[PDB]
Amino acid sequence: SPKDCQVFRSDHGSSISCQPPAEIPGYLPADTVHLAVEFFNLTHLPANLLQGASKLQELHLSSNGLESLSPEFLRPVPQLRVLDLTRNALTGLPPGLFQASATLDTLVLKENQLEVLEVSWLHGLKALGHLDLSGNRLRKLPPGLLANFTLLRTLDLGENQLETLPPDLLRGPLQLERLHLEGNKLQVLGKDLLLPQPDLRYLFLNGNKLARVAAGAFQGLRQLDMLDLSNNSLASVPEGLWASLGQPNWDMRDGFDISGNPWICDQNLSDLYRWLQAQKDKMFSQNDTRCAGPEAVKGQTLLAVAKSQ
Ligand SMILES: *[C@@H]1O[C@H](CO)[C@@H](O)[C@H](O)[C@H]1NC(C)=O
Ligand SMILES: *[C@@H]1O[C@H](CO)[C@@H](O)[C@H](O)[C@H]1NC(C)=O
Ligand SMILES: *[C@@H]1O[C@H](CO)[C@@H](O)[C@H](O)[C@H]1NC(C)=O
Ligand SMILES: *[C@@H]1O[C@H](CO)[C@@H](O)[C@H](O)[C@H]1NC(C)=O
């Protein structure tokens, strides 16, 4: 039949995929463990779609044009581990949506149309490990957002319109691993934002409007594997900024990228020159890391000017 979904009876249980011309099932098999319902065109799903699905662990509801969710949608699946709502038209979440969702690990709200983030929309999440809010229209983040997510590993906020970051943004997770802030409108990075996460591994800050990094901003970073600062508006950086990054302290799994910045290569960059000389086999985009001035060295690479001392 062409109206039936695709079941894959397996050792855990079924995995079911529905896309047109298939029909959204009115009930789920009791042993459904993974459910994907995508490429439909509906303002909302049936509020009781998940009824009885007490083995469901992963719910992929990508690209359906959804504009709202029922407040009771997840009540039949307190054991849910992964909820993925990529590429829908959500502008908010109903209150209490997550009241019984204490074991949810991954929440993906990538590419909806959230313009604000209400702290109360996440009430009830506590085991959260992966929070993906990228590709929305957020300008501002409320205080206390992450304070309960002790187990948070990844925070993805890239490709929003964020103009500032609240100072307490990283204060709840015990050991954040990856922080995606690329493609926003951030302009400064303060002394304290990264203080709660000394063992952060991945920091993506590229494609912002970054003009100033406070001198102590990286003071406590002990094991950074990837630092992307590329594509910003940095003309200089203070002395000491890099003292704990890279060699000789840490062998970065990937490295760093400071390309696409209007570097001003005078003696205020000598500390960066020194640091760059010790890290060159970890330097991405070296050919695009060039001085914007002064006129004598305009257009030359940082490394060439660094090598020249
Ligand atoms: C979805 O449904 C509405 C009304 O039926 C329609 O205007 C819209 O073009 C449809 N298709 C897509 C891709 O959104
Ligand atoms: C964190 O936990 C308390 C409940 O003890 C709650 O009042 C507060 O709203 C929670 N914060 C978030 C973002 O859920
Ligand atoms: C950085 O990267 C690409 C080009 O490298 C481009 O989007 C733009 O010049 C910079 N990023 C932005 C504005 O988000
Ligand atoms: C970057 O390197 C490519 C080839 O490696 C070269 O075309 C270019 O001249 C370099 N610098 C530029 C475009 O400023």
Residue numbers in the entry: 39 to 347
Task: Quote the study's own text.
Recently, we reported that the adhesion GPCR latrophilin-2 (LPHN2) is a TGF-β-independent receptor of LRG1, and the LRG1/LPHN2 axis exerts both angiogenic and neurotrophic effects under hyperglycemic conditions. LRG1, an LRR protein family member, comprises LRRNT, eight LRR repeats, and LRRCT.
The refined structure of LRG1 adopts a horseshoe-like solenoid structure that includes eight central LRR repeats (LRR1-LRR8) flanked by LRRNT and LRRCT domains. The concave face consists of parallel β-strands, whereas the convex surface comprises short 310 helices (R113-V115, V157-L160) or connecting loops. The LRRNT of LRG1 contains three β-strands, and its N-terminal β-hairpin is stabilized by only a single disulfide bridge that connects C43 and C56, whereas the LRRNT of other LRR families usually contains two disulfide bridges (top). The LRRCT of LRG1 contains one disulfide bond that connects C303 and C329 (bottom); thus, LRG1 belongs to the CF2 class. The electron density map of the LRG1 crystal structure and OMIT maps for glycans calculated by PHENIX42 clearly showed that N-acetylglucosamines are attached to four asparagine residues: N79 on LRRNT, N186 on the convex surface of LRR repeats, N269 on the concave surface of LRR repeats, and N325 on LRRCT. The glycans attached to N79, N269, and N325 were located on the same concave surface; among them, both N269 and N325 are highly conserved. Specifically, the glycans on N325 of LRG1 LRRCT likely hinder LPHN2 binding, whereas the detachment of these glycans in a particular condition or a differential glycosylation mechanism relieves this steric hindrance, allowing the tight binding of LRG1 LRRCT to the LPHN2 Olf domain, similar to that in the FLRT2/LPHN3B complex.
